């Protein structure tokens, strides 16, 4: 997250770190046994780390749980990033309380102009590289359909939206992929892609979660 602020310990209690000997992606806890993340983050041997704030120090509150299943959406396209969503089943249920909690799925799409919270442990610089120890947050609005398509001609599907800032300096970034975009207490997006990070006229592009609510519930119920 570039241009964001330190969230504070366990103020985003649904935020997870996906770990393979290092932090590589984010995700969102949606019930005690299941996490939602981005398909482009798929790999085998995932450990899910819940209740994290400082990802390099054991502070108390963490729960580390192995992934037992990782289900990439069957229509995921790795060139376009269409259908960039995956579901991870935890090997055992997480223990939920005030510091570890699930986030609700949407019950309608969010409009243009709605303010959302985006969070993660990704790069905090637009040019070079610097990775934070603690969780960073950014408030960003959802942009209009037309501005999104003007920004990325021919690349925006109906399963994507843009959010952020067209003037530069505030965006999600590498290492934030798969992390949550929450508006009014609902998970509306998943951090997916963008051109650099925090460049002028190039906002972040997010998977539109409300299009996948029925798929998510059926996939959970079957697995
Ligand atoms: Ca920690």
Numbering used by the authors: 16 to 34, 37 to 67, 69 to 125, 127 to 130, 132 to 206, 211 to 219, 221 to 248
Quote from the publication:
In all three cases diffraction images were indexed and integrated using XDS and reduced using AIMLESS.
For trypsin, the structure was solved by molecular replacement (MR) using MOLREP.
